[PDB]
Amino acid sequence: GETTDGVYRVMTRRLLGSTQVGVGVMQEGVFHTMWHVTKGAALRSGEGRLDPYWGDVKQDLVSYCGPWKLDAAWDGLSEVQLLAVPPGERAKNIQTLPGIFKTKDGDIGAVALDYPAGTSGSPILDKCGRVIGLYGNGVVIKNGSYVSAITQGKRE
Amino acid sequence: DMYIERAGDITWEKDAEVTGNSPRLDVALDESGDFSLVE
Ligand SMILES: O=C(Nc1ccc2c(c1)CNC2)c1cc(Cl)ccc1-n1ccnc1
Numbered sequence: 001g002e003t004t005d006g007v008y009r010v011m012t013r014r015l016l017g018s019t020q021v022g023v024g025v026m027q028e029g030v031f032h033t034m035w036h037v038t039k040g041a042a043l044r045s046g047e048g049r050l051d052p053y054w055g056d057v058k059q060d061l062v063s064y065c066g067p068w069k070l071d072a073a074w075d076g077l078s079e080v081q082l083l084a085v086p087p088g089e090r091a092k093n094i095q096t097l098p099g100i101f102k103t104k105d106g107d108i109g110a111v112a113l114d115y116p117a118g119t120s121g122s123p124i125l126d127k128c129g130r131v132i133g134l135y136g137n138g139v140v141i142k143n144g145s146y147v148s149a150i151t152q153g154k155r156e
Numbered sequence: 157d158m159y160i161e162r163a164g165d166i167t168w169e170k171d172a173e174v175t176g177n178s179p180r181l182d183v184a185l186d187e188s189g190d191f192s193l194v195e
Binding site for chain 1: 157159160161162164165166167168169172173175176177179180181182184185187191192
């Protein structure tokens, strides 16, 4: 069905009404989302079907129709935009300066914006509009708010 | 059965709402892809 580049909502009719479980990026004929959104299940796009191609539970990422295409990286200095797509609400860009997740295997950029779980998979962008990662996997801080990593896959 | 619906273009928007802080957090990532705080 629709394969035009852009941001899309991931919906399900299995629960009550139509519920938004996540978000994803269509780029170069490949649909990119977080693993926890679909759990690797097939997706529908109108009459067409999207089948999983690559995925990893630890990275929390999954690609459909082809390999992961997103390879822009946060420069470690500039503000970024979360192109937030919340359930039942219009897509909206939010500009923020990312924090840092310090891990035993290196540092990762992190965005401190609190959105509903159904916003998981919303792309994070650089000043050129390139997707530097997806929002939706992170930690719940002492306050109760969510701080998400800037999760980026690898382009083979 | 899951389905997708278009929500917009991927573009940087000048004069967008600037918010959010930049915390430095010590975290650990387990095999199930779940982050946790290290204190
Ligand atoms: O649940 C969320 N994210 C998630 C879920 C399941 C899994 C993972 C991440 C990675 N391994 C499996 C979540 C996402 C957002 Cl955007 C805001 C809050 C969230 N949240 C986490 C706790 N309570 C709420």
